[model samples]
Target chain A: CGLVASNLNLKPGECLRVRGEVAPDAKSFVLNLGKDSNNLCLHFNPRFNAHGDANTIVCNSKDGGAWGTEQREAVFPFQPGSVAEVCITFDQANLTVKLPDGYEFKFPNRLNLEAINYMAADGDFKIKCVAFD
Target chain B: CGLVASNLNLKPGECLRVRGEVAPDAKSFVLNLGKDSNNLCLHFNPRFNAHGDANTIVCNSKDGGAWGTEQREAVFPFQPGSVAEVCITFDQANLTVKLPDGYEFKFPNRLNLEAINYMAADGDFKIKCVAFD
Candidate 1:
């Protein structure tokens, strides 16, 4: 696994954003962020099923690695059969993630933004797009 | 603290699953999937105290990167085992994790099954597994 062996070049202030889609028929999916070593994680569990919508986000940040305070969520009227645009922003100290249904999440700064770079998606769901800018 | 420094070439539509026993067996554990450069994540949280289980799983991939969800969970008739099984799939995604509550996850397909090589378990939990699978 790519975990237990991760070492990114993040600093005290930086951000990454991504976008993707969920199965228009998905029932629930869990979202998470964690350390690639030793399995230290934080999550937004049981994401709701999307019936096809536009770009949606799951989490965000701004205070380095304090995910608990910098995480956000949002929901949209997702468009089925297309790629969704999900975005997350980090400023070294916090994280901000957007989700569907106009919901937003703000997580705390757990670690230093310099210690991140492993991302992924897991569960019984579908995605149309995935990117980090 | 290993992130933003990935080069694992994860495939599309392929799945990567993981399992690790909850500490009590862990009242709750969030599983996830994501990319290493962006803020894409899936999670499970609000875990409980150690009842200590044997193993558990969060997700598994097959079609290579189609995480419309192939994951699992458990309650763990745990035993405070020092090391648990957190096995997943994919000889490429750098993953194959097994979880607790006597749990084992097996995800589904959504990709052509050949381009994945990135793997990571995200969220907010501690890991102590066999060689950190």
Candidate 2:
């Protein structure tokens, strides 16, 4: 994983804050915002042509393998020379994903969102910074 | 992380099929369903009181920390002596979470659902068998 790793010791219904900058050209970036090893996954896809920008938010799980019903396709931008700031507050049962500009995505901490420590990013995506507050 | 590490080099709209069996009594467990570090998180909350089963899927992201509108709460059982078979078909944009007996939770690969490789079960959950198909 080209990104940094930060684990949060989480309790049921507890939430952590993730503040960082995703650099430009950082396409197909994946990150873990919750400590519950099975709660949520977030990312960006630059090649998805949904209106000129890769702005589809695909959210799925390991239970029965379904896709995109609980997800939204936003028209967000990852400008080639700019950075995207992210702030996520998540716990064991629910979450709140906030953009610097105030866009919010709220959902439940599906399944066993409980864990000893949660991983931040685990793959190759240009990372600026990752923190668990 | 009480799990193995495997990185999948992926492209836009690409998919990785995850087939495995989750053990019983695993509460508040979270796992990544796509290569995009930020696509989907899946888990089980044994303490959740939503119908006698620890079932609730919290689907949120780092964009706005939004959750659950893209997640479903299924009433599944993690019996103390049985295993839950899982089959997930996902890519850089979409996913399908399948349960052993045909229950499912589906969603989008939110945010930067792209990466060189994907990670699963990054926290503390009982081990069964996790393999990429």
Candidate 3:
């Protein structure tokens, strides 16, 4: 296994852009923003299969390992062997996620955090690029 | 507020180069490499006055919230308002850190990690640039 940790004081009005590729036989992958690992602000996951979800995207927040309500994404634009991209912009009230197909989804900022200290991508994905712009 | 998530698969042979400034009024800043929040391979800290030690560079590892013995560095080249740069290379056996003043120190990689999943800069420093070179 591998390990990497980064402290990011990412604040409102900043855009986090990420580009990656999904495998053809991938189950699902997750993108997470957190104060630390114990508290998660955004758990954005797109599932091909797993978690009782197929072709469904889910978003949720976790405080002290306890997960909050789930917000399911309405559309699924991902296809096998295709690249995935997202532009994430946030404010105190909400996070705006611009998906790969040019559609957008907004989720609540339940933790009410001013900045994120940890950023991670987990499971079945290869990250090509990530940056703040 | 802000949120960010990234996936990185950093390996042993790849060198991680970081450039950042330590605030003039800073107490301490840390650069961490971990499996996640709970498991740490390296906690490399430059202290000004925060801990019991002043102007000391301390290194340690944490596994499941338990911290191991600390290893103190031999030199302190960091100065007031000066930017610090570090080039880190590691293997399963040791981590070689090239400090800002053209000096190098090697520490035992006690955790025996193969890759780093999290890379963070925390406390009183602002990250300028970071890359795997």
Candidate 4:
């Protein structure tokens, strides 16, 4: 019931773009990038009404199943039941996100991942496309 | 919404590999390749009870929304609620498919397509990944 694209060579200067529509009754959704679910370099989560947060985009990491401090951006450009595209690019130290509205959000790369090989999408999102550039 | 990866240069010697899980109550699923839905060079359909066909894999082409004659392969290696991976490769004259059981099925390049640019997956399939090789 989820989308996973693994064995990728996602490095610096390569952007991952995902276009999808959120569920009308969605609670939240996450785009994860890393080696695996337990060792994610980026966990980009958008909350429609989950984790006691509404309209908040939270960025975090999980190194060996332990979650790091989260970074939150309240510039929610996402509309539930509406289509949106999200872009992500990362370097050795930080990761940047481009919300559907063209606003950028930044998060620290706690694991200092030089390159990642896994990607997954979960929660109430219907994917239209996934591509890299 | 379905999963789509577009604007790809799928030429000869290249292959498309999709890994996914089929739903328990699935009737059918399709993988379409070409410029778009209406101009597809390949419409690969796996029927589990659709169009009066049970456990059949049908291949076809479409040009400007007109359906071409279909080719069927009854080698069903799929089970409901199970995971499967499918591989596809093409040349100027033909397209070859590798079912999960390692059986290769062939279909003609009815449109004489030298290359393709779009791909989509629909119906009761949960995509694990989409990759090109």
Write down the TM-score of every candidate.
0.35, 0.38, 0.60, 0.54
Instruction: Please provide, for model 3 over B24-100, each residue's C-alpha lDDT reduced to its tens digit, 9 standing for 90 to 100.
Output: 78788887776765777888898878679988999999989999999998798786577888888889898899998
lDDT of 3 by residue, A45-101 (tens): 898888899999999999999999999988998865777778888888898899978
Q: If ranked by TM-score, best first, what sequence of candidates would result? A: 3, 4, 2, 1
- What overall lDDT goes with each candidate model? 0.38, 0.45, 0.76, 0.80
- lDDT score of model 4? 0.80
Residue B106 Cα positional deviation in candidate 1, in Å, after optimal superposition: 35
Q: Mind giving the per-residue lDDT tens digits that candidate 4 earns over A91-122?
A: 99888888888898788888888887777777
Where is model 4 more than 4 Å wrong at Cα?
A1-133
For candidate 4, write residues B1-133 as lDDT tens digits: 2455544667798888878778888898877888776888889888989998999988899998999998889699988789878988998878889989889978888888887777777757666556656
Encode model 2's per-residue lDDT on A3-56: one tens digit a residue: 333344444443433323444444444555433444333332332333343655
The Cα RMSD across the true interface for model 4 is 11.3
Residue A116 lDDT in model 3? 67
TM-score of chain B of 1: 0.37
- The window of 10 residues in a row where model 1 chain B has the poorest summed lDDT is B124-133
Per-residue lDDT tens digits for candidate 1, residues B20-106, read 433443344543344432222332332345234234333333322333453445554334323333433443233333444444443
User: Candidate 3: which stretches are off by over 4 Å?
Assistant: A1-9, A18-24, A34-41, A49-85, A100-105, A110-120, A126-133, B1-11, B17-21, B34-43, B46-85, B98-122, B126-133
Q: How many angstroms is residue A24 displaced in model 2 relative to the true structure, after the best TM-score fit?
A: 4.3
Could you give candidate 2's per-residue lDDT for residues B2-23 as a string of tens digits? 3433344444544333333344
